[PDB]
Amino acid sequence: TSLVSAQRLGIVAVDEAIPLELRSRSTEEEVDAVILAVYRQVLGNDHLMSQERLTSAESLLRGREISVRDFVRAVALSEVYRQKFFHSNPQNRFIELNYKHLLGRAPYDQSEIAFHTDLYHQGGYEAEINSYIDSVEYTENFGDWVVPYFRGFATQRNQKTVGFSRSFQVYRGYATSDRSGSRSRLTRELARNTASPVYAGSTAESLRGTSAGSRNQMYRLQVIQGAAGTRVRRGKAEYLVSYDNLSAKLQQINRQGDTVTMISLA
Amino acid sequence: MKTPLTEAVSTADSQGRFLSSTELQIAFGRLRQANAGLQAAKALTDNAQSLVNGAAQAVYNKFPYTTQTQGNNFAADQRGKDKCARDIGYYLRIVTYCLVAGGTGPLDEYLIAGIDEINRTFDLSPSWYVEALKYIKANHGLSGDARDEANSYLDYAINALS
Amino acid sequence: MKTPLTEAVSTADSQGRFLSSTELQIAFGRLRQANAGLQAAKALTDNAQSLVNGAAQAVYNKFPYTTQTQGNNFAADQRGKDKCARDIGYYLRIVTYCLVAGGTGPLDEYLIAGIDEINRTFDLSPSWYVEALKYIKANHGLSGDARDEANSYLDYAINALS
Amino acid sequence: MKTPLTEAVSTADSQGRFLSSTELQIAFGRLRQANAGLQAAKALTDNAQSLVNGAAQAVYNKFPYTTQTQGNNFAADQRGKDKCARDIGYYLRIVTYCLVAGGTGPLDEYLIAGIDEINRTFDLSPSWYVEALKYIKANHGLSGDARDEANSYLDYAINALS
Amino acid sequence: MLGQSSLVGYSNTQAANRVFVYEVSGLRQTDANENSAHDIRRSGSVFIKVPYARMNDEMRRISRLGGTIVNIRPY
Amino acid sequence: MFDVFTRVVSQADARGEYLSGSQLDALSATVAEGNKRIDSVNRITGNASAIVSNAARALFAEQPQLIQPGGNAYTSRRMAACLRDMEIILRYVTYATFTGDASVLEDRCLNGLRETYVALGVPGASVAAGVQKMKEAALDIVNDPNGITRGDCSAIVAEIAGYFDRAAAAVA
Amino acid sequence: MFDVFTRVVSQADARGEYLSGSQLDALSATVAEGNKRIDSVNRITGNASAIVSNAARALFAEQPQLIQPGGNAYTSRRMAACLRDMEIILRYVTYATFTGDASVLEDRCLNGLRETYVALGVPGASVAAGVQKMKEAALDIVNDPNGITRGDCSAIVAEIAGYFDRAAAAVA
Amino acid sequence: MFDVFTRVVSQADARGEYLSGSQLDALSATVAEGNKRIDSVNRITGNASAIVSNAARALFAEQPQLIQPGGNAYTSRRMAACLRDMEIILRYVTYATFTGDASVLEDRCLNGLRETYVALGVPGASVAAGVQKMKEAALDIVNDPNGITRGDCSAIVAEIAGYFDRAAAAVA
Amino acid sequence: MFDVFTRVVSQADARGEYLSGSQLDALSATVAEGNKRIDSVNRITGNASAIVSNAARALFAEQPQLIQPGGNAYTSRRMAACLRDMEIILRYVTYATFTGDASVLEDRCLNGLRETYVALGVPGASVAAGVQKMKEAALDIVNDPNGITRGDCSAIVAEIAGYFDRAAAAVA
Numbered sequence A: 001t002s003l004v005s006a007q008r009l010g011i012v013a014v015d016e017a018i019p020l021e022l023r024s025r026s027t028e029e030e031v032d033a034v035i036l037a038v039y040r041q042v043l044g045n046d047h048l049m050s051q052e053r054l055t056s057a058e059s060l061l062r063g064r065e066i067s068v069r070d071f072v073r074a075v076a077l078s079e080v081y082r083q084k085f086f087h088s089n090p091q092n093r094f095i096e097l098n099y100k101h102l103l104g105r106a107p108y109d110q111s112e113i114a115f116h117t118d119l120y121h122q123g124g125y126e127a128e129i130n131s132y133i134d135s136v137e138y139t140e141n142f143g144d145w146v147v148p149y150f151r152g153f154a155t156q157r158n159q160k161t162v163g164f165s166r167s168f169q170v171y172r173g174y175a176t177s178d179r180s181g182s183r184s185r186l187t188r189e190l191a192r193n194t195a196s197p198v199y200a201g202s203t204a205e206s207l208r209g210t211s212a213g214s215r216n217q218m219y220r221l222q223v224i225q226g227a228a229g230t231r232v233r234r235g236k237a238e239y240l241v242s243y244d245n246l247s248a249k250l251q252q253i254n255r256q257g258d259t260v261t262m263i264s265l266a
Numbered sequence B, C, D: 001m002k003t004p005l006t007e008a009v010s011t012a013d014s015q016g017r018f019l020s021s022t023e024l025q026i027a028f029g030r031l032r033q034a035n036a037g038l039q040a041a042k043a044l045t046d047n048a049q050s051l052v053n054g055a056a057q058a059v060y061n062k063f064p065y066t067t068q069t070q071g072n073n074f075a076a077d078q079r080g081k082d083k084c085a086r087d088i089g090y091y092l093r094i095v096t097y098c099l100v101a102g103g104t105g106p107l108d109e110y111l112i113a114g115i116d117e118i119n120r121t122f123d124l125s126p127s128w129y130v131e132a133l134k135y136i137k138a139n140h141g142l143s144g145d146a147r148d149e150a151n152s153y154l155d156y157a158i159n160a161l162s
Numbered sequence E: 001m002l003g004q005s006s007l008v009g010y011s012n013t014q015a016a017n018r019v020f021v022y023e024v025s026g027l028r029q030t031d032a033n034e035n036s037a038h039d040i041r042r043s044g045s046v047f048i049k050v051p052y053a054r055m056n057d058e059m060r061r062i063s064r065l066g067g068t069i070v071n072i073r074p075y
Numbered sequence F, G, H, I: 001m002f003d004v005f006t007r008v009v010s011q012a013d014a015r016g017e018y019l020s021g022s023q024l025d026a027l028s029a030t031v032a033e034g035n036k037r038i039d040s041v042n043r044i045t046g047n048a049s050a051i052v053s054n055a056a057r058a059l060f061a062e063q064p065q066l067i068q069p070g071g072n073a074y075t076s077r078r079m080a081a082c083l084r085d086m087e088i089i090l091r092y093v094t095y096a097t098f099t100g101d102a103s104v105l106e107d108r109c110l111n112g113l114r115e116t117y118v119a120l121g122v123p124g125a126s127v128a129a130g131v132q133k134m135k136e137a138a139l140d141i142v143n144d145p146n147g148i149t150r151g152d153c154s155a156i157v158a159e160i161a162g163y164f165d166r167a168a169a170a171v172a
């Protein structure tokens, strides 16, 4: 996005990122950069140990035996990708990680969760992974030679608006990674076809003045509430409380049976 | 983790399939190896302190310069000797973990992954640890299956370091 | 085909790794199972004709309408009976292949992959073949590991069918 | 959900373009088909009960073993007959939905997607439902564009089951 | 000519353990790839190594993009 | 998405019953105004550029702080994005008019747009004012009597205005 | 995931300690129990389709609102997803039985299942009833005495029952 | 991200005004300071490995709980990840020094870092201590008078210290 | 991929016949040699780095033109590639020994290697000589009677020699 929203949302680096294309007759440093970019983006910005590198796959990329898309497929199908994204993750978290790593976006619909779940159940992890890489979306966005990059913060054709908001649920910052078993943040949002407020970068913080407590810290409690007291006017509720009253807010939320969806520092 | 049971279930889950006779044979091989691996782990554990000290002394003998020249990466002082003994104890303890688990998974997750950056950043020669592993392999006093499995883990570490 | 040795090699090749003790244990399990598998395959192929004839008769008795009503997918005429006996022989032969190989790989390669759209395309109910495989389970006379491995493959075929 | 209007908008939105004259002609064709579809659906609804009972009877006649063989998947008791009549009613009602919608979308969303898994796990023969659909084709008494569109949906279901 | 090790995947099947070389010509700007973020660099003979299990997809892609499959060679 | 027919179909299937006579006659009534629906879609499409540009000009004239430097419509990137958002909203309104149901507009365009605009800092009230201007123009265009067969398009005009209202309520 | 061995290994590494004698003897006792564990895994696997189909049939018999139109198991795709969920739970129960540890079952299947169900409206209590039906069906299959070497499988049966209870509790 | 020039450019563009005379003279003063800024970047880069290794050694000596088994710097993978974090923080501090602006730190290096450390269980206070050690070592290296033209580099040293302190406060 | 069992399975399935008694007896004889095969695989794996490094050093001792500047092994990247290739060939030879069939080595490493090396300007003769040196080191290591049960390993050594021959003839 433009700078004025970019600094607020903490997505400046994504906006200024330039797609990396492996051209013909590329030098050694260009193949090195492509391999590094693929490892960074497909493995979700983990510190990749040299013992986890795909030496044969990157040799085939180096000798121009395979394309960038093929190397991306090899990294995605590799046991390293399985270990850190599949074997200890729920299926819905796993496929949103696949959407982030392979297509550079957040899931748009619950039907996309129904797809890749049935696809896994029929054809295994390999068929499920190949669905993303062989998709029309991957072809039109990246082709055979462009390293996949995150696209959820930019307006795409055939995109739902919610994706942009949901993008902030799968991209938590430039210095973040998809390393830690974890549950998807988008489960209820996808199932009920909703959107959640974006609290990313500096958007989550709120004014304090003298209303914050001793340590000048406010907390935002996003809860789902119903009538169990006073009249409830909305199903969604947001409470801004100081640290000193946080426990009290939690307990009164708890004794009314309201479910806490998110708690963040504001 | 690279252990036969976890590998078998990982392969089945990646294929989304139930456990067939292939996975059952994997479990049968694991069962055939496990008792020898466990008493090897206990033999290495009961003799761990003397093995670690002897390996440290063997490294100091083959590379005498490590005990004389000053430097944070050497064992000239007691701090360096304690660090060296601790490293060899780490090698032996995760080797026992490998024997217990029936695979190289403990070595991969706990010691092997990123060890090159470790030995390069703190300028530790991997040849020292290779010598320590060779001493452990030559002095563990095991026989048969237990010896073969323990030696496989020790040579796995040696090959990783070279 | 899916076998202990080939799966061990495939997952070791996926990581660019030599074969560690985990793959050796997988091979040991394969060695433990292999003699029973070979003797089971031999026992199954000795009376393979009798087993196939009995399975076909069991399907005909369990499903009498198959030998009576006309239709390309039914065994009312001699052509249908020959096709049916050929199908049962296919099932039994691939089961013996699975016993030799040590996994459900021959079944997946030659029979299981695409069986459902063959049965839907040619209007053959899977319940017929389920009855045939149940007869083969009940009349092979195998014991011990031979029996257990052969029954695992036959039950694998049944579960894929139903 | 394939209907002419939803598909026209889906195609235009996938190309990020406004609805041009192509989509206008799609809507015109839908308009030309809609009244015949609505009378087809109304005629099927008013005659739904006789069609379902007659289709069930035709299936029982063509496959008599369904009415004396004991089992959860058969209709030898009243519970099985009720399940059979309910399934045929589902087919007829979703066909009426397709006629209302103008495409096979109701059949794809509610009945077609996943029917193979159901027919396999509950050992239901798709030939039974094919015969029920054939009876509905032969006895819905529609003419012209109503008949043609309803027969297209019924043949779509038949081709899905075969 | 390499690639088989990484192209075939992990089906392990004999049917998937075959790769083929596609020779494609005439990859131009069509209405099908109007919104392609990347640009076509070559329209002459390009060689794509396709495993068996993806031969259905790739040629469709080729057929969707106006490319002409002139030859397919066993690897 | 859903169209006017599939919405009734899904509800009937959830209830598990055939469409009643009243629902079938209601759909017959719906296809009776099909020609005017096609005309309204075509008329908005044929003047979409004028609708977006004139509405944007009126919005920037009434709210100069948008195009003022530092405003959210200032810089050519942000301005182009604003004009694109107006065209996108108009396009999805036409989609909802064509289908006879608001599912495409809600599910694809409107859902998450308030949160998106709040996260971006795009003034939702300003977008709502722009959408209202597009509504006014597009309803004039749909109601233009020149060069068309005489008839009563009050129902389709009200339906289109309802879609434009959903858009304006959603953005703010 | 962890198996029965790697769980002890990971705890010991997080302490910097060698496996004690008692821990090695516990693992040796688990090893001597291995054949019955493999037999139970094979028996549940060999009857997996029958277990899933019979349990699903019984669940729909005692909970007719699931298959009633508008119910959560109504329409082919939902019913197929329901049968798939039952099969998935059974498969990960067999994986946990094979490894001797519940980590694979917890991480792949149960983590986030309850919230997914609640979000989607899938009745978790009904899923728990189906899991309990597969529970007793599989425990009768594992405890079947003919055609097997005789012996006491009570510990393995208790462990498998615990996995089936952990799944049941998790979905509700 | 911004450099020392584009920061005031973006501020002026939001104001919709030209850079005043005072801003242009301040930028000219920054340009006259440029050579010593390039020396500071070069000196930190040429000694980056020593800075990272010595600071890590000091941090693990002062906090042995990190490197003992079960600690967050125990095991080779975790220790190597820690060494990479140190190197990365030092590299981004050099980036900030080179550009003359801190936006590269917030945009990239500190963007979600505290969230990452909390999620993984990395002790942020220990990271801040390591960053402080790298700060003291790098400031000593920059201030070294041997082998360089003598001059006052107090302003650039204060700026580098500010970048280091901001990195430390992002995780503390 | 094929192993020793699945190979004969594939010929029998192509002929549509059950495996004869002779084939089953040959497979039983293969099973009786399985312990020796596992020992050979383990010994080569446990000495893989030594075999590759000693063979590479000997290959550069003679044929010095590889490591002179302008040679194919000159520069660090090309030396690392050469070492990598020797280790890869040895690894696939161990795979072939483990499976008892040469399919893995031919399909994944050998087929197309002579053309790749020609189109890169890699000397096939020199890498074939390196494969011969790896052969001789590995065969000496496998045929080491110390610390192993005594027996006749002539058949497995002949099979390993055949695999090494395959890779030397296919790469030259």
Ligand SMILES: *[C@@H](C)[C@H]1/C(=C/c2[nH]c(/C=C3N=C(/C=C4\NC(=O)C(CC)=C4C)C(C)=C\3CCC(=O)O)c(CCC(=O)O)c2C)NC(=O)[C@@H]1C
Residues within 6 Å of the ligand: B033, B144, B145, B146, B148, B149, B152, C021, C024, C025, I032, I033, I034, I035, I036, I037, I038, I039, I040, I042, I142, I143, I144, I145, I146, I148, I149, I150, I151, I152, I153, I156
């Ligand atoms: C030629 C290869 C050399 C040789 C081999 C040889 N080995 C055995 C027997 C055994 N070797 C093993 C192997 C292992 N046990 C383990 O735990 C591990 C690690 C997983 C390994 C690799 C085993 C289990 C046996 C059987 C029991 C035993 O120790 O004897 C033999 C004996 C005959 C047989 O094949 O069983 C032989 C001949 N002998 C030589 O002289 C060659 C140098």
Ligand SMILES: *[C@@H](C)[C@H]1/C(=C/c2[nH]c(/C=C3N=C(/C=C4\NC(=O)C(CC)=C4C)C(C)=C\3CCC(=O)O)c(CCC(=O)O)c2C)NC(=O)[C@@H]1C
Residues within 6 Å of the ligand: D021, D024, D025, F032, F033, F034, F035, F036, F037, F038, F039, F040, F042, F142, F143, F144, F145, F148, F149, F150, F151, F152, F153, F156
């Ligand atoms: C309110 C929307 C305005 C209005 C509409 C209106 N239109 C018709 C009739 C028709 N208009 C069409 C449309 C098209 N024919 C084409 O070929 C194209 C391009 C693809 C279009 C858009 C058609 C086919 C008809 C029917 C034949 C005819 O020309 O009349 C009517 C008459 C009633 C009807 O529903 O058909 C009306 C009312 N009229 C107004 O007064 C509003 C300004």
Ligand SMILES: *[C@@H](C)[C@H]1/C(=C/c2[nH]c(/C=C3N=C(/C=C4\NC(=O)C(CC)=C4C)C(C)=C\3CCC(=O)O)c(CCC(=O)O)c2C)NC(=O)[C@@H]1C
Residues within 6 Å of the ligand: H032, H033, H034, H035, H036, H037, H038, H039, H040, H042, H142, H143, H144, H145, H148, H149, H150, H151, H152, H153, H156
């Ligand atoms: C504080 C940072 C220390 C310091 C620095 C300082 N440097 C200069 C002058 C120069 N430094 C350079 C730098 C380079 N020349 C190269 O080719 C390279 C590699 C690309 C580098 C890094 C240059 C070009 C100059 C100018 C020539 C000269 O040597 O004078 C100064 C002098 C003032 C100036 O701005 O030029 C200073 C102050 N001085 C100290 O005392 C600190 C320890």
Ligand SMILES: *[C@H](C)[C@H]1/C(=C/c2[nH]c(/C=C3N=C(/C=C4\NC(=O)C(CC)=C4C)C(C)=C\3CCC(=O)O)c(CCC(=O)O)c2C)NC(=O)[C@@H]1C
Residues within 6 Å of the ligand: A045, A046, A047, A048, A174, A175, A176, A177, A179, H066, H071, H072, H073, H077, H078, H079, H081, H082, H083, H085, H086, H088, H089, H108, H109, H110, H113, H116, H120, H122, H123, H126, H127, H130
């Ligand atoms: C070392 C001083 C301390 C320490 C560090 C530690 N960090 C991690 C993991 C990660 N570190 C980062 C940070 C970055 N990645 C980037 O790309 C950027 C540049 C913008 C940064 C700042 C990330 C994202 C991770 C996530 C995991 C990954 O592998 O990348 C670990 C690993 C934790 C684990 O393995 O579970 C560690 C150990 N730990 C200490 O104890 C020191 C105080």
Ligand SMILES: *[C@H](C)[C@H]1/C(=C/c2[nH]c(/C=C3N=C(/C=C4\NC(=O)C(CC)=C4C)C(C)=C\3CCC(=O)O)c(CCC(=O)O)c2C)NC(=O)[C@@H]1C
Residues within 6 Å of the ligand: A055, A056, A057, A058, A059, A060, A062, A063, A064, A065, E002, E003, E005, I066, I071, I072, I073, I077, I078, I079, I081, I082, I083, I085, I086, I088, I108, I109, I113, I116, I120, I122, I123, I126, I127, I130
């Ligand atoms: C060493 C004995 C000889 C030698 C080797 C050498 N090889 C290359 C380059 C490549 N080697 C391969 C081969 C493979 N890669 C794999 O992944 C596998 C398994 C499927 C194999 C068999 C490939 C594909 C390449 C190209 C990619 C790459 O360079 O990594 C080189 C480098 C050539 C160059 O840089 O142009 C070298 C030096 N060279 C000698 O002189 C020895 C005789």
Ligand SMILES: *[C@H](C)[C@H]1/C(=C/c2[nH]c(/C=C3N=C(/C=C4\NC(=O)C(CC)=C4C)C(C)=C\3CCC(=O)O)c(CCC(=O)O)c2C)NC(=O)[C@@H]1C
Residues within 6 Å of the ligand: B059, B060, B063, B066, B067, B072, B073, B074, B075, B076, B079, B080, B081, B083, B084, B085, B087, B088, B090, B091, B110, B111, B118, B122, B124, B128, B129, B132, H057, H060, H067, H073, H074, H075, H076, H079
């Ligand atoms: C002994 C063979 C030689 C030797 C040892 C020595 N090692 C270090 C420092 C470290 N050793 C490690 C290794 C590990 N940490 C782990 O968690 C594991 C995996 C379980 C391993 C293998 C690490 C990470 C360090 C650095 C951090 C630390 O201080 O612990 C030193 C000190 C180096 C320094 O600069 O402080 C020494 C002296 N020295 C000899 O001379 C022997 C021949």
Ligand SMILES: *[C@H](C)[C@H]1/C(=C/c2[nH]c(/C=C3N=C(/C=C4\NC(=O)C(CC)=C4C)C(C)=C\3CCC(=O)O)c(CCC(=O)O)c2C)NC(=O)[C@@H]1C
Residues within 6 Å of the ligand: C059, C060, C063, C066, C067, C072, C073, C074, C075, C076, C079, C080, C081, C083, C084, C085, C087, C088, C090, C091, C110, C111, C118, C122, C124, C128, C129, C132
């Ligand atoms: C016997 C149990 C019942 C029966 C048999 C029957 N089968 C067919 C035809 C086919 N059978 C197959 C199956 C396979 N072919 C294979 O290659 C394998 C895997 C190795 C299998 C299992 C196929 C593909 C066909 C169709 C093509 C062909 O005819 O070969 C028929 C003929 C049906 C037709 O329409 O021609 C019949 C009669 N039918 C009964 O009534 C028995 C109870």
Ligand SMILES: *[C@H](C)[C@H]1/C(=C/c2[nH]c(/C=C3N=C(/C=C4\NC(=O)C(CC)=C4C)C(C)=C\3CCC(=O)O)c(CCC(=O)O)c2C)NC(=O)[C@@H]1C
Residues within 6 Å of the ligand: B021, B024, B025, C033, C036, C144, C145, C146, C148, C149, C152, G032, G033, G034, G035, G036, G038, G039, G040, G042, G142, G143, G144, G145, G148, G149, G150, G151, G152, G153, G156
């Ligand atoms: C426990 C739930 C039931 C039970 C089990 C039981 N099994 C054994 C022993 C063996 N079972 C096997 C299993 C297999 N052999 C194969 O080839 C396969 C298929 C690939 C399988 C699953 C084996 C190898 C043994 C050992 C040899 C033997 O059969 O004796 C025992 C005996 C004790 C032991 O642990 O060995 C027992 C108790 N028995 C019951 O009564 C339960 C219903």
Ligand SMILES: *[C@H](C)[C@H]1/C(=C/c2[nH]c(/C=C3N=C(/C=C4\NC(=O)C(CC)=C4C)C(C)=C\3CCC(=O)O)c(CCC(=O)O)c2C)NC(=O)[C@@H]1C
Residues within 6 Å of the ligand: D059, D060, D063, D066, D067, D072, D073, D074, D075, D076, D079, D080, D081, D083, D084, D085, D087, D088, D090, D091, D110, D111, D118, D122, D124, D128, D129, D132, G057, G060, G067, G073, G074, G075, G076, G079
């Ligand atoms: C009638 C033609 C034959 C027959 C029927 C029969 N069907 C079942 C069971 C089920 N039928 C379905 C089908 C659907 N459910 C849906 O929601 C829809 C889509 C809207 C369809 C098409 C399903 C899912 C089942 C299983 C669950 C349930 O019982 O509802 C049975 C009973 C099988 C059982 O095991 O209970 C029977 C008997 N039987 C005949 O003999 C006829 C020839």
Ligand SMILES: *[C@H](C)[C@H]1/C(=C/c2[nH]c(/C=C3N=C(/C=C4\NC(=O)C(CC)=C4C)C(C)=C\3CCC(=O)O)c(CCC(=O)O)c2C)NC(=O)[C@@H]1C
Residues within 6 Å of the ligand: A001, A002, A003, A004, A005, A006, A153, A154, A155, A156, A159, A160, A161, A164, F066, F071, F072, F073, F078, F079, F081, F082, F083, F085, F086, F088, F089, F108, F109, F113, F116, F120, F122, F123, F126, F127, F130
């Ligand atoms: C114009 C009337 C007002 C305005 C608009 C404005 N919008 C954005 C940015 C975005 N708009 C969207 C919306 C969509 N994208 C889609 O694909 C769809 C259809 C499904 C919609 C509705 C999104 C997601 C963005 C962000 C991503 C992107 O910009 O591509 C901007 C730019 C904000 C920035 O800082 O760059 C602007 C300016 N602004 C005003 O002031 C007007 C009131």
Ligand SMILES: *[C@H](C)[C@H]1/C(=C/c2[nH]c(/C=C3N=C(/C=C4\NC(=O)C(CC)=C4C)C(C)=C\3CCC(=O)O)c(CCC(=O)O)c2C)NC(=O)[C@@H]1C
Residues within 6 Å of the ligand: A090, A091, A092, A113, A114, A117, A118, A120, G066, G071, G072, G073, G077, G078, G079, G081, G082, G083, G085, G086, G088, G108, G109, G110, G113, G116, G120, G122, G123, G126, G127, G130
């Ligand atoms: C059947 C007994 C009950 C039932 C089931 C049902 N479940 C869903 C949907 C999902 N189930 C899962 C769970 C998993 N998928 C996986 O891949 C894994 C293993 C790793 C698990 C645990 C998920 C993720 C979904 C959502 C995606 C999908 O639709 O497949 C449904 C469908 C809900 C819907 O269509 O909206 C159903 C019907 N329903 C009942 O009524 C039974 C009590």
